[PDB]
């Protein structure tokens, strides 16, 4: 009857170990006030964006496109130095991807209107790597763990870049205490 992650708190209702990464961790009662499907879809989206974002924050320092506008090792400098029409194109393309991938059901009243729509299941499997039944739960656990780790890592990387004015790897190689 007690939460496994937080043993001095009672087990949150609507958390019953069914979803991947469920360790009964909801001390603030978000799942008692909001639906778990929207929360899982949001968690997967924040985590996937942070997976791409942490991988970018490490890789863009080491590898660049040719040109002066793509030569910033620090990612917050690359936000400003990159061509503006390209980044606006990125914004518009992300908007179109969000529009079509959710099949015109984008909001808190119409996404999951179809009963077949599963949280975080946009239908995305380009190489069909999910063709294995007993692999599925371990795959979803690995995806959500990578997403949570990526959220914490990218949050830290951005704010440490703000503190140090250094790209992450070269901050680790040229470290200066505050």
């Amino acid at each position: 009857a007690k939460s496994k992650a937080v043993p001095f708190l009672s087990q949150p209702e609507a958390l019953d170990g069914s979803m991947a990464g469920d360790v009964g961790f909801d001390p603030f009662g978000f799942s008692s006030n909001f639906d778990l499907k929207w929360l899982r879809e949001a968690e997967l989206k924040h985590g996937r964006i942070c997976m791409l974002a942490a991988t970018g924050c490490l890789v863009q320092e080491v590898v660049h496109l040719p040109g002066e506008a793509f030569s910033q090792k620090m990612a917050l400098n690359a936000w400003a130095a990159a061509p503006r029409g390209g980044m606006i194109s990125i914004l518009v393309a992300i908007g179109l991807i969000e529009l079509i991938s959710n099949r015109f059901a984008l909001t808190a009243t119409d996404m999951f209107a179809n009963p077949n729509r599963v949280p975080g299941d946009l239908g995305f499997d380009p190489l069909s790597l999910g063709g294995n039944g007993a692999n599925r739960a371990r795959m979803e656990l690995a995806e959500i763990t990578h997403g949570r780790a990526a959220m914490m890592g990218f949050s830290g990387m951005v704010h440490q870049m703000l503190v140090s004015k250094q790209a992450p790897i070269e901050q680790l190689m040229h470290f200066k205490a505050v």
Binding site: N33, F34, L106, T107, A108, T109
Partner: protein, 161 residues
């Protein structure tokens, strides 16, 4: 330039306004010792005044003979950021507010006691609604074209003519 106005970065009366404001703050600065918190506050005000006048002078704003920026709102694209783009920002936010309020009213009509929903807000449902408002023009237009926004005239109460 437009309507006989001159750009603010070359208007001498804009410079006179800036000089008068800086002098008015500096004569207050003269009565305080350097390093005192009133002196630092007054110098920060001087810096903010200088930065504001510089930014207004480098923005393509037009100044009249009074020496103050004059906005152009006839639709020309060289001054679209003075009324048209703030107008689009307002219209987006206002349509958001109207759409989410209408959605909450229509939800509250379905409740057991609608008036209790009006005075005691269902906060999770209201937060869901205020999340829905980012796509309000397309949602409102689809609501309109499906016959779900406008109600016919024979279903609205009217007074005797």
């Amino acid at each position: 330039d437009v309507a006989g106005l001159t750009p603010c970065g070359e208007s001498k009366e804009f410079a006179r306004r800036l000089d008068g404001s800086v002098k008015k703050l500096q004569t207050r600065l003269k009565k305080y010792e350097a390093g005192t918190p009133p002196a630092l506050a007054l110098q920060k005000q001087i810096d903010k005044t200088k930065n504001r006048f510089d930014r207004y002078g480098k923005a393509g704003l037009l100044c009249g003979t009074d020496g103050l920026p004059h906005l152009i709102a006839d639709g020309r694209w060289s001054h679209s950021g003075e009324f048209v783009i703030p107008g689009l920002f307002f219209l987006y936010v206002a349509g958001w507010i109207g759409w989410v309020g209408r959605s909450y009213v229509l939800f509250a009509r379905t409740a057991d006691k609608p008036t209790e929903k009006e005075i005691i807000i269902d906060v999770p449902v209201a937060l869901s609604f205020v999340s829905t408002g980012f796509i309000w023009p397309f949602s409102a237009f689809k609501e309109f074209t499906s016959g779900n926004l406008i109600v016919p005239a024979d279903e609205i109460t009217v007074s005797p003519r």
